[PDB]
Scaffold this active site. Structure first.
Site, PDB file in Angstrom:
ATOM      1  CD  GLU C  55     -23.829  35.064  -0.409  1.00  0.00           C
ATOM      2  OE1 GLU C  55     -24.835  34.449  -0.835  1.00  0.00           O
ATOM      3  OE2 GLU C  55     -23.745  35.524   0.753  1.00  0.00           O
ATOM      4  CD  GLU C 260     -15.249  30.290  10.269  1.00  0.00           C
ATOM      5  OE1 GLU C 260     -14.536  29.713   9.416  1.00  0.00           O
ATOM      6  OE2 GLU C 260     -16.284  29.785  10.768  1.00  0.00           O
TER       7      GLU C 260
HETATM    8  N1  LIG Z   1     -13.733  40.794  -8.222  1.00  0.00           N
HETATM    9  C1  LIG Z   1     -14.018  41.859  -8.973  1.00  0.00           C
HETATM   10  N2  LIG Z   1     -12.995  42.609  -9.449  1.00  0.00           N
HETATM   11  C2  LIG Z   1     -13.275  43.683 -10.195  1.00  0.00           C
HETATM   12  N3  LIG Z   1     -14.469  44.153 -10.573  1.00  0.00           N
HETATM   13  C3  LIG Z   1     -15.463  43.385 -10.100  1.00  0.00           C
HETATM   14  C4  LIG Z   1     -15.330  42.255  -9.308  1.00  0.00           C
HETATM   15  N4  LIG Z   1     -16.572  41.710  -9.019  1.00  0.00           N
HETATM   16  C5  LIG Z   1     -17.412  42.500  -9.641  1.00  0.00           C
HETATM   17  N5  LIG Z   1     -16.813  43.530 -10.321  1.00  0.00           N
HETATM   18  C6  LIG Z   1     -17.466  44.522 -11.173  1.00  0.00           C
HETATM   19  O1  LIG Z   1     -18.818  44.640 -10.778  1.00  0.00           O
HETATM   20  C7  LIG Z   1     -19.662  44.851 -11.930  1.00  0.00           C
HETATM   21  C8  LIG Z   1     -20.845  43.913 -11.898  1.00  0.00           C
HETATM   22  O2  LIG Z   1     -20.446  42.648 -11.326  1.00  0.00           O
HETATM   23  P1  LIG Z   1     -20.668  41.199 -11.988  1.00  0.00           P
HETATM   24  O3  LIG Z   1     -19.423  40.649 -12.574  1.00  0.00           O
HETATM   25  O4  LIG Z   1     -21.755  41.304 -13.066  1.00  0.00           O
HETATM   26  O5  LIG Z   1     -21.205  40.219 -10.853  1.00  0.00           O
HETATM   27  P2  LIG Z   1     -21.931  38.800 -10.898  1.00  0.00           P
HETATM   28  O6  LIG Z   1     -21.715  38.257 -12.296  1.00  0.00           O
HETATM   29  O7  LIG Z   1     -21.382  37.893  -9.847  1.00  0.00           O
HETATM   30  O8  LIG Z   1     -23.428  39.080 -10.715  1.00  0.00           O
HETATM   31  C9  LIG Z   1     -18.769  44.776 -13.169  1.00  0.00           C
HETATM   32  O9  LIG Z   1     -18.585  46.055 -13.763  1.00  0.00           O
HETATM   33  C10 LIG Z   1     -17.472  44.141 -12.653  1.00  0.00           C
HETATM   34  O10 LIG Z   1     -16.322  44.691 -13.286  1.00  0.00           O
HETATM   35 ZN   LIG Z   2     -19.050  27.177  12.563  1.00  0.00          ZN
END
Ligand SMILES: Nc1ncnc2c1ncn2[C@@H]1O[C@H](COP(=O)(O)OP(=O)(O)O)[C@@H](O)[C@H]1O
Ligand SMILES: [Zn+2]
Ligand SMILES: Nc1ncnc2c1ncn2[C@@H]1O[C@H](COP(=O)(O)OP(=O)(O)O)[C@@H](O)[C@H]1O
Ligand SMILES: Nc1ncnc2c1ncn2[C@@H]1O[C@H](COP(=O)(O)OP(=O)(O)O)[C@@H](O)[C@H]1O
Ligand SMILES: [Zn+2]
Ligand SMILES: [Zn+2]
Ligand SMILES: [Zn+2]
Lengths: 423, 425, 425, 423
Positions: C55, C260
């Protein structure tokens, strides 16, 4: 790709006759081309384009020549069958120079007949250029454009939006009084006999234009110059009439009149309607308006009128292929009533998305037959009831060829019947 | 393509009136164009694009001129019917220079009406250029873009994703109080008589915009200059009203009000549903979510409301073509219930994916009729029970032209009926 | 097209939290980028490409930054919405220079998010270039590529064959313990109050990513800087939560959990099947193999589970639109059983391949309904039998948001119920 | 677009093992590349192209290396995924220089694996060039081309006409004796323990190629070099087997064997047939031949065999998705019998042109169910009758994995039953 004129016309409202109702809607353009500085300083807005659609030879060119002629302003006239792509093309660059020369010779009028060939890829590049050229120029320029055609259904819908031809005027085929006035316009030039009657010539020409009637009065003098006569007599006039034999037969004329009187009657009698107009022998309803069930039944009733009038007057074997669209239009309205607007009690408020079970289709159809037959039996009955004043309306209609709304209800008044003011 | 304006507007929030709710959602942009350095240093993020969709002449251009005007910032304006391919094209290179001139004159506002013609493959290359040009520039630039349209259904869905126009604002056709304030905006310039009443002009204009209403007040002075008068009287005002005769008749207005009150009542009464909003006479239902059988019956119930309200008030002969989409939407929901989600006991948890035996199709249809008629009989009954409080709504609705859910609920409270807190905020 | 990074990251496995199971599958790449000469001299082969699908905002970019960060190796980053054809194009010649610069800075990591726009003929020419560029370079180069996306269903199937992205890793939306650890990562920088609880923030965020959660903790400090406070309190934290209101309601959460749990029970109970995996509230069948009639009935049984669980727990009116694909998948399996594999005694071993007589279609449909209803009655009965230990699972599942297969089994063992050993390893 | 070799191979018929039947059909090419002047002066004609189709890793490359190796002739090897259009292309000019270099180094062999990517516009310009390049060169050149693939169904049908690859050879996945000989080919290089048994490794690998088995014996020495051992023991051999866990389960193997024994039995028992071949667990019929009604019933009978064998052995609940094509093939034959060849007495000699009345469709279908069920009941009965010798055939089949035709009938002879010489 080389036809446009720039003349100061000699042909005014004197050379045009029969289309008096069309003449009343072009007078606001005559007052505009005469003094545009009067229209500019006041704050008003004129149409950037006026449409002149109808059958080939109804007097499209002559009307455009009368507006420029009466206003004492220049007239431009080119054809739409001229701009055809021959090695890619500079079709768009043309349109740009039309309005530029118009501003140099301001005030003036522009005209283009058969613009349906150029406006039906490269074809859309020239079409879209004309659209921008209309939205660009304003009231200050003091110029107006008129584009005629032989078919209105084959031109582009974008050439009808506001600012890009917003005014629509229909020029119809001439009637008895319409042709008698045409036969007096061309007769001013030629020498006619004492035994000649223009009223019988006007009566014996159903389904004939002002231009196709000009072909008759020009060949009558041609046959008078071939034979050797100084006066155009009835013998050479009736001879040119055999060259024509298309035309409406007198039996057909009766059928048409009765059909037309059917519709008219139906409207001037049903519960509540949306205006009855001129009744003439010369040959969807949903819009952005909201209708109730009672309204649509009456819409169907009217649509069925003429056929019922035919059935009542000529009998089952006498019904014609004239009711073709009326029958269709009525049925389609009835299916929308049943399957789309849920106005069928038997079918319920379900709405068929036009995988529909055969039984449901049956139910839909059975109800559409129920509505159509029901209303048809209703129309037949109204004609049956008002047969004698109708008979009369039809006689009046055959002689005049076109009767307005008023007199019909007055003809009914003569038979002690009161209809309703729906003109 | 070549229309672009960069004026310091004189037209502010004084020249625009009637759309007060729309005015409250554009004030955050006014505080942004005034001082973007206040929005930058704090850490916030503004919308890279704000949509202004509605009917032709609702005041799309005038709203964009008021935001730039009130914030004392420049206003750029161009049409979307200008960029049309004429010998391949260089339509993409244009968009690149819009944001470059915007950064030179930062802070400033940009506006493009009828962008639905250019944005409906050369057409897609100019379209995709505008998408990148939005994601590229950030908050530091202090500029915003507003793109208007005559139809929202014909624009590209990619011109609605976050960073590429994420904010959606609807400008509606003016009501009674909405037109009375519009009739006071264009009347400041012109000279009006003592016997003239703007309240009756506002009341007798259903289905008329703010731009189609200026055409009436400009022709009233035109008819006063043609006849020869120094004051615009009621005679020339009522004359310009006959030039208009695509308007709503007073009988139709009643039908509309009853239909609209049907929908509201249905919703404000349903077991569980989600939100009831402003009821007004001025003319896919799922999202991601998850719904139960009970929910969807109520969704259908609401969809059937207005028609049932029409049937109850005007009778079988009185039902109109207004219920067209509602009827359709309801049926489709009912087919999805039967053939797709196995919510029909008779049909079972089988799921039809279009080779389906005629008998099964029959069964599906017969159950779809069972659900629709069942819910319809239910809606009619709810209307029947609350006819009197509904006539009271209809009354208010016809005079004000638009009422709120709270206003609706209040009228019911007056009749001693407590309805579900389904009111939107 | 022109984004390409190559930084030595500061963000490691400390800045990433919640996706611990995803972290265990990326450690073999960390040991590879640290010392590739150890992997080359031994004789092993690493994946030429590792997929990071999920997502929008699940932490795709942050995971790729952690692998390069923990291994003390460079990180290259670019977008897939950049390479768009504008006057034919030279998009293929680009890909050729990516691996050339990678060999100059060897060992290093490469990353490309939203590669679904460029990879959905000029478009195929650039796509096929990337395919050859993967098969060409070997283990000796010591470089690895990671290409992320917002949709996995819209990318080219050729970008999934061995040697051309053979490894597939899914990053899911965070759970309760997943979000609590996210709320502790972004809180190290900002100053929080004594009255603030991160556990309630972790519990009241269903259907919210790690990135959409960062938008909440950044606006809480923004509202604290706007009002005028030195400590981020519960008042400004709960305010940013109202800015969000496409979240899962607590009633919906229960429905999802029960659905689920139905699927899981069905699985762990059926005669034989093909393993049960993690059960989670946080929200196209079969391979070649060879299956018998008994297996396919159980395949249908599991597909029907959740709906039966819904019916058992909430009743007939309580069944949701969640069973949409299950219902479909089950029916389609049943038609293949009847019309294709001749597993219907009534229909015989004839095989329909679409001109089929109406009567035969009837027979086919009637048998499919017989199979579906039969298995559905069977699923309902199981959920009914095990309603108690299931309520328990549902309870664990609502609090933890995700439970393992082993955790489910465990809950059952408590109610003294042995299930089949069908847990994944 | 740069992969072709030109080596004098060291790998001969010693490095290839298990595909002995495939080895007998490539020996005529070995005698040809050794002395083509012996084949030219005599008057014979060799195949201008020999096809090597099968599953990925069946030993396609290794077979081509053995033919060039045994004949002491050069070997050329390029891929078909190399020639991909990148700025129009010179794909056709390539093929022209292949045969030119082949005539310079005559006699020699050519090989191209995965030629299904280039041969599936510009794509057809390169494909048609290869067709002409085959018809042009003759026996005097002393060169032969071999083009392998991962899928035979996706290559162009024109690359199969005479003179343009007329010989077709299938390389199957190895059996028990097939894998035991592969496990002895790779074991010559590596050092193995005294407690290791290659027979149990060969038995526990169903649905595994010679190449996917090479991955197992190479990782067993890799795990022996990681742990620290001088001899590859059973512990590291069984560990690499868990990396693989696709594969056929032992329960599935039984189902497959019974199904396969069904078909075999059916043919070796019906009235008159078109040859029974090798029976192996390792996973249209009309041609330019004329068949009678009796023939097609037996064609359907055989097609239904395996399913009947499944039903007889495992029961109604035990029947598998294995009979998918057999069921289809049988039904289609039955519809052609009824609706096309008029072999249904109830339907008559009418021929449905595949607007057909629903009743007639019913009649057609009802008769197709009659034929299928009738023959199916017949197949079930034959399996029921010969259950005990079948049981035995199936045991023999599970251990050997592939049994030829002969021994099956001999296993039946052991159960005092005489079938018919249809090998
Ligand atoms: N699982 C996670 N743990 C910690 N920070 C997260 C996590 N998911 C997203 N973030 C934070 O959200 C921000 C943007 O998310 P991102 O990594 O670019 O999402 P995606 O690459 O899936 O579009 C970043 O600053 C990142 O540190
Ligand atoms: Zn189902
Ligand atoms: N209504 C009319 N009244 C008088 N003359 C007419 C009329 N209609 C056509 N004509 C004459 O017919 C001739 C050709 O007709 P024209 O105006 O060119 O027809 P159209 O433009 O519709 O093709 C002209 O000489 C014109 O004067
Ligand atoms: N039948 C076989 N006998 C011996 N070795 C084999 C066999 N099949 C494959 N191999 C070995 O497997 C390795 C790779 O297989 P390969 O011949 O390239 O398969 P393919 O050409 O069908 O893709 C080679 O080292 C080859 O010796
Ligand atoms: Zn008619
Ligand atoms: Zn409605
Ligand atoms: Zn078979």
């Amino acid at each position: 790709a080389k036809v446009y004129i720039e003349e100061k016309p000699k042909v005014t409202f004197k050379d045009v006759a029969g289309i008096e109702e069309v003449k009343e809607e072009v007078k606001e353009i005559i007052e505009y081309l005469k003094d545009p500085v009067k229209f500019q300083k006041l704050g008003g807005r004129p149409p950037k384009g006026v449409l002149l659609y109808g059958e080939p030879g109804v007097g499209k060119t002559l009307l455009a020549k009368a507006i420029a002629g009466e206003a004492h302003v220049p007239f431009i006239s080119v054809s739409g069958s001229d701009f055809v792509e021959m090695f890619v093309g500079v079709g768009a660059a043309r349109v740009r120079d039309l309005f530029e020369t118009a501003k140099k010779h301001a005030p003036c009028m522009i005209f283009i007949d058969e613009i349906d060939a150029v406006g039906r890829d490269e074809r859309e590049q020239t079409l879209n250029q004309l659209l921008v050229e209309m939205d660009g120029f304003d009231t200050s320029d003091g110029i107006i454009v008129i584009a005629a055609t032989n078919r209105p259904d084959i031109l582009d819908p974008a050439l009808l939006r506001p600012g890009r031809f917003d005014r629509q005027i229909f020029i119809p085929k001439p009637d008895v009084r319409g042709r008698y006035e045409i036969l007096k316009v061309h007769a001013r030039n030629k020498k006619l006999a004492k035994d000649v009657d223009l009223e019988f010539v006007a009566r014996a020409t159903p389904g004939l234009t002002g231009a196709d009637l000009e072909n008759l009065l020009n060949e009558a003098a041609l046959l008078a110059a071939r034979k050797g006569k100084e006066e155009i007599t009835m013998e050479e006039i009736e001879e040119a009439l055999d060259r024509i034999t298309m035309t409406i037969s007198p039996k057909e004329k009766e059928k048409i009149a009765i059909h037309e009187a059917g519709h008219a009657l139906m409207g001037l009698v049903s519960d509540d309607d949306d205006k009855v107009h001129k009744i003439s022998i010369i040959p969807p309803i949903e819009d952005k308006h909201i209708y109730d069930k009672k309204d649509l039944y009456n819409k169907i009733l009217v649509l069925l009128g003429g056929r019922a009038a035919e059935e009542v007057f000529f009998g089952k074997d006498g019904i014609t292929t004239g009711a073709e669209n009326d029958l269709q239009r009525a049925t389609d309205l009835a299916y929308r009533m049943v399957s789309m607007w849920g106005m069928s009690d038997k079918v319920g408020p379900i709405a068929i998305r036009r995988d529909t079970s055969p039984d449901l289709l049956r139910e839909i159809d059975e109800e559409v037959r129920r509505i159509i037959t029901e209303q048809y039996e209703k129309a037949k009955a109204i004609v049956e009831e008002y047969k004698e004043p109708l008979k009369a309306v039809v006689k009046k209609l055959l002689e005049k060829e076109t009767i307005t709304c008023e007199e019909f209800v007055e003809v009914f008044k003569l038979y002690g019947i009161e209809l309703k003011d729906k003109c």
